Ligand binder design. Structure first.
Ligand SMILES: CCCCCCCCCCCCC/C=C\[C@@H](O)[C@H](CO)NC(=O)CCCCCCCCCCCCCCC
Lengths: 215, 292, 54, 336, 231
């Protein structure tokens, strides 16, 4: 049967036990991507954390452990490594409302690629509209028609914000099994983590129900 | 006549039961990853499958008119297995309902403190409770034959004087009846109704209402438990409370005759459970279809 | 740009490999495969009689 | 400036010479060769224990040990004979796209999106696996790693470059920069003097580890390349692409030989490896199963269908008595 | 890489004592550890064992019951408990480590040792006490077992040990063929089934000592009588 292969299989069983007890501890944390188009304040969103290559950030809020995988220094073709983050709970997206200097459509084009991607058919997308203060300071002496000439509406902060939020939201082509949470943060807001927490707990409830079969 | 209807019902309960259970015992324990939800379904399916496997002998007995053809050891084994598994099914329904209530009312705790290890360590609870509740079966259950032979509760261990024997017998039967009605239907339905109502309240308040699937499967499980288990417990309660008169006067006889047809419906839940707890899942359906 | 020089030099060297007529290459590769087919465990069952994994 | 003019002129005369070399076809030569017959493999061991998708394996030289990399952050060194594990290396970056096994058995390489090639040391006075050097200077993501010996390694990143390192000093000693897309595969020649690299530019390049500059390029695919492997003798290499097609070249002739395709497959190739004799060409598709090709008759030979997700890596032992396939089903099956 | 033990001295018969081994310099938790003894002017005899994680524990028949053994991983210390000390126990106790996996090298390291003065299975017989030699030429030493040690799995379980005078023993070869780390590539080992041979190619001054044979197939680990290469 064995001479010390019994000791070998005992070592195998012990490290199998260690693998489970590490998988069960790495499965408690909830994972988030953090994409972005350009100078959009993904840096500022990261700076709202509590406490080369791919950089990770770990933080806990209300007895829930988070992980935020930030890519963007990875200047390469997305289609080769975007399939690694298949099981992520959410994709914290960030764009810039003051993006008329870009030489925004690039951000609008990018959102279509990641929201309608084949690996993210059932993954919620938290969306962070940034620099609302800059939008307020800028639209007062400029048209919105620069980004969208066909737009027919007033020139006021609330109307412009609603129109742009709708404009990003309707790019979603799978309206049934996803959800696009939206928020208007600034460089001074302090409830961004709270919004992310609410979105993540809603997605957790969704997943638990779909596993239990009710949903 | 219509006395064959319970015999007719059990026939469906077997063929539709073991065939359905034989799948979930396979597609959900052998050819699928191990999670808490699938382990709970696995245990429920195991209990129901063993019950349905023991069923045909009980069907034969009921057809013969409760004149046990099986031997002493077969009698003891079949009744102990049917009792333990029939209570295990109900307690596991309660456990699954409570697990879903936790997962949908406290998601943070439900992600920090539920692993397959804790599910393993906890799921043995209802089985142990079922065993301790079926403990009286070993002692009081025995094969007695008439001089002219139903497997009933004889009492010769403490038979002593037959004048005092009937007192202890009535005590034992009354205790069993009341404990059945209080810890086989009262607590389990309380838990199921309360938990599923709470998750329905939240899933209605906070959105999530895109189809009729959630508040159709939820009412399906609650109704398929109640409408199917209640009459048996009710007739059993009436029998337990009126045993004193019945064993002496036979005042109520419809209660004596309705036990078999009602027990048929009662057992039908064990063959209806998997198709309502596991087959709903899209992932499980896909896995079964691809497997075969 | 400066990368064009590297590309040009690499092309120059690739323009000087002593290529061999395909007849000899194909014949030799067929010969090697044929001479190897007698000792391929996946093909001939005989060396797969003491299969350690079974 | 105008350098594109002579660049394309050299490319055109290269094509002219290539045409001048094609005096025969494998199809014509293989006119009368007996088909290999239908082979039927079957699972022997199942190496369960991972908790996420598997992205790479590599057999040891002894043909008994193997190392598998996953996204669980673990690098398990199995024992294919008895299925019991040997080590469990916890990585500092859970994102891993490749792994390797040094010929001597002493070291194990592993890299991923962190674009640091970490060399792991197995045999030490103390009994735990330690990391020896962390090779850095790459500006992309590692795709494949291979050991020349215990002192030299070669990487291939998404920065459109492949580099030859030096484990001792940890400094790049030769950079191969002639390519133009994301490199995604390496395959050292058996004599360990020249290696290929097939990348997203729909082009395969064979280098020269001494002169440090490509000696010949290959362009025959309609899309990106995902896996390469040298033919055992050292005068050919097979390729896999996203366009459901595998191709086999030869070097001394600088042409193509055969193309393996079938109208029933529209999936992509993820890994390609040969057999000991070279008569069989394994290839792990991403339509949930692997396929077996006769590298001369061009017809399909066998099917290895045992997984429940994409087959992400496969390899063939040096002794030729086994083949192992990994899949995103968190499992690792060994065939015979 | 550094094992030191303590707890020895003088004891009274039928008494008790505790033995402790201080591990400092390697991953103690993943190494199994044993206990071996040496009566004065005698050989080696196996005593106890603990697997990694305290999963399995064995003992020696002559010390069964009255010896209990345990370890404390977080403190990196090995404990052996003396109870009811008989008289055939005065010996200087060693503290040996060993790890078990494919291709491993069990019995790699040996501690210094402490003196404890109290005032059916496999049989290995080297059948030789001393051979006289001079530096420079080869020499061979033989070992013999009771039953064939060749397990059907494929490898033979025979170890060889060296003991310089007044020093802790170290390992020369394991599995009859493989050399140990840090050993000059001039030793060698061979044999088949029951007969075993160890061959030094060219002696050096630092090789004089006593060589010990040991099996590992059946679990009671019997050693050899002792062979001395007294120059
Ligand atoms: C969900 C948990 C439990 C479910 C498991 C299966 C269902 C069983 C529960 C249904 C109710 C009890 C069934 C057992 C026996 C019945 O048939 C009936 C009720 O006691 N027995 C008699 O009427 C006794 C009449 C027999 C002859 C009476 C003659 C009296 C003198 C001779 C002595 C024989 C009877 C011993 C006590 C008087």
């Amino acid at each position: 049967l064995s001479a010390e292969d019994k000791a070998a299989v005992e070592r195998s069983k012990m490290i199998d036990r260690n693998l489970r007890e590490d998988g069960e501890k790495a499965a408690r944390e909830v994972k988030l991507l953090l994409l972005g188009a350009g100078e959009s304040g993904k840096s500022t969103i990261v700076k709202q954390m509590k406490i080369t290559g791919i950089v990770e950030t770990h933080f806990t809020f209300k007895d829930l452990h988070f992980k935020m995988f930030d890519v963007g220094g990875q200047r390469s073709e997305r289609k080769k490594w975007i399939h690694c983050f298949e099981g992520v709970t959410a994709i914290i997206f960030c764009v810039a409302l003051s993006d008329y200097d870009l030489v925004m459509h690039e951000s609008m084009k990018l959102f279509d690629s990641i929201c309608n991607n084949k690996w993210f058919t059932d993954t919620s997308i938290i969306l962070f509209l940034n620099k609302k203060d800059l939008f307020e300071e800028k639209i007062k002496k400029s048209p919105l028609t620069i980004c969208y000439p066909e737009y027919a509406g007033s020139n006021t902060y609330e109307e412009a914000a609603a129109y742009i939020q709708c404009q990003f939201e309707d790019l979603n082509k799978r309206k049934d099994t996803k959800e696009i949470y939206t928020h208007f943060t600034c460089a001074t807001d302090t409830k961004n983590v709270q919004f992310v927490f609410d979105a993540v707990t809603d997605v957790i409830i969704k997943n638990n129900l779909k596993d239990c079969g009710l949903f | 006549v219509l006395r064959i209807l319970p015999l007719v019902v059990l026939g469906v309960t077997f063929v539709l039961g073991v065939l359905g259970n034989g799948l979930v015992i396979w597609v959900a324990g052998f050819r699928m990853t191990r999670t808490v939800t699938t382990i709970c379904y696995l245990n429920l399916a195991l209990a129901d499958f063993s019950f349905t496997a023991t069923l045909p002998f009980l069907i034969v007995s009921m057809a013969m008119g409760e004149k046990w053809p099986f031997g002493w050891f077969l009698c003891k084994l079949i009744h102990i297995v049917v009792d333990i598994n029939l209570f295990g099914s109900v307690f596991l329904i309660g456990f699954i309902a409570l697990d879903r209530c936790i997962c949908v009312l406290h998601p943070v705790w439900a992600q920090n403190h539920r692993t397959v290890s804790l599910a393993m360590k906890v799921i043995v609870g209802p089985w142990i409770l079922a065993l301790v509740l079926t403990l009286p079966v070993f002692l009081f259950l025995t094969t007695v034959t008439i001089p002219n032979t139903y497997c009933t509760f004889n009492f010769a261990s403490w038979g002593g004087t037959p004048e005092e024997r009937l007192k202890v017998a009535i005590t034992m039967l009354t205790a069993r009846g009341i404990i059945r009605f209080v810890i086989g239907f009262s607590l389990p339905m309380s838990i199921v109704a309360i938990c599923y109502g709470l998750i329905a309240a939240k899933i209605h308040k906070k959105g999530m209402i895109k189809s009729s699937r959630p508040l159709r499967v939820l009412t399906a499980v609650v109704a398929s438990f109640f409408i199917c288990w209640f009459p048996f417990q009710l007739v059993a309660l009436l029998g337990t409370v009126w045993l004193k008169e019945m064993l002496f006067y036979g005042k109520y006889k419809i209660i004596d005759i309705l036990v078999n047809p009602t027990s048929s419906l009662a057992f039908f839940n064990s063959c209806l459970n998997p198709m309502l707890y596991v087959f709903v899942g899209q992932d499980f359906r896909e896995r079964l279809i691809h497997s075969l | 740009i400066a990368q064009a020089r590297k590309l040009v030099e690499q092309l120059k060297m690739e323009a000087n490999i002593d290529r061999i007529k395909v007849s000899k290459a194909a014949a030799d590769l067929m010969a090697y495969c044929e001479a190897h087919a007698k000792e391929d465990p996946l093909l001939t069952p005989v060396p797969a009689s003491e299969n350690p994994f079974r | 400036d105008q350098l594109r003019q002579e660049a394309e002129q050299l490319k055109n005369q290269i094509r002219d010479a290539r045409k001048a070399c094609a005096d025969a076809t494998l199809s014509q030569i293989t006119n009368n060769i007996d088909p290999v017959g239908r082979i039927q493999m079957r699972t022997r061991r199942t190496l369960r224990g991972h908790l996420a998708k598997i992205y790479a394996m590599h057999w040891g030289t002894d043909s008994r040990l193997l190392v598998s990399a996953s996204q669980d952050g673990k690098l398990i060194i199995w024992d294919s004979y008895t299925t019991n594990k040997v080590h469990a290396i916890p990585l500092r970056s859970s994102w891993v796209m490749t792994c390797a096994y040094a010929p001597s058995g002493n070291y194990v390489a592993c890299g991923g999106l962190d674009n640091i090639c970490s060399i792991y040391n197995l045999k030490t006075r103390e009994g735990n696996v330690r990391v020896s050097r962390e090779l850095a200077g790459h500006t992309g993501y590692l795709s494949c790693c291979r050991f020349l010996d215990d002192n030299q390694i070669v990487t291939s990143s998404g920065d459109t470059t492949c580099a030859l390192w030096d484990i001792e000093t940890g400094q790049q000693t030769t950079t191969f920069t002639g390519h133009t897309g994301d490199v995604m595969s390496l395959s050292l020649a058996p004599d360990t003097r020249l290696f290929v690299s097939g990348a997203c530019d729909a082009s395969a390049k064979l280098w020269d580890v001494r002169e440090g500059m490509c000696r010949q390029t290959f362009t025959g695919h309609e899309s990106d390349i995902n896996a390469i492997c040298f033919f055992p003798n050292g005068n050919a290499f097979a390729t896999g692409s996203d366009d459901a097609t595998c191709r086999l070249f030869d070097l001394r002739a600088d042409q193509e030989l055969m193309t393996y395709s079938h109208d029933n497959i529209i999936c992509g190739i993820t890994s390609v490896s040969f057999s000991k004799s070279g008569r069989l060409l394994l290839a792990g598709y991403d339509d949930f199963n692997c396929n077996v090709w006769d590298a001369l008759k061009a017809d399909r030979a066998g099917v290895l269908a045992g997984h429940d997700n994409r087959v992400s890596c496969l390899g063939v032992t040096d002794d030729g008595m086994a083949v192992a396939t990994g899949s995103w089903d968190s499992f690792l099956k060994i065939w015979n | 890489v550094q094992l030191v033990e303590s707890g020895g001295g003088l004891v009274q018969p039928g008494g008790s004592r505790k033995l402790s081994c201080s591990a400092s310099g390697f991953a103690f938790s993943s190494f199994g550890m044993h206990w071996v003894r040496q009566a004065p002017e005698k050989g080696l005899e196996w005593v106890a064992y603990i697997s990694s994680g305290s999963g399995t524990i064995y003992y020696a028949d002559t010390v069964k019951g009255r010896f209990t053994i345990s370890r404390d991983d977080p403190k990196n210390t090995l404990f052996l408990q003396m109870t009811s000390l008989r008289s055939e126990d005065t010996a200087m106790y060693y503290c040996v480590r060993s790890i078990y996996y494919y291709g491993s090298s069990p019995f790699d390291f040996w501690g210094q040792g402490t003196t404890l003065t109290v005032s059916a299975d496999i049989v290995m017989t080297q059948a030789t006490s001393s051979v006289p030699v001079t530096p420079g030429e080869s020499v061979s030493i033989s070992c013999r077992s009771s039953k064939s040690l060749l397990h059907s799995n494929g490898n033979t379980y025979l170890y060889w040990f060296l003991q310089r005078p007044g020093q802790s023993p170290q390992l020369l070869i394991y599995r009859m063929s493989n050399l140990a780390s840090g050993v000059p590539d001039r030793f060698s080992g061979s044999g088949s089934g029951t007969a075993f041979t160890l061959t030094i190619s060219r002696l050096e001054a630092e090789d004089v000592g006593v060589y010990y044979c040991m099996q590992h197939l059946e679990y009671p680990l019997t050693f050899g009588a002792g062979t001395k290469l007294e120059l």
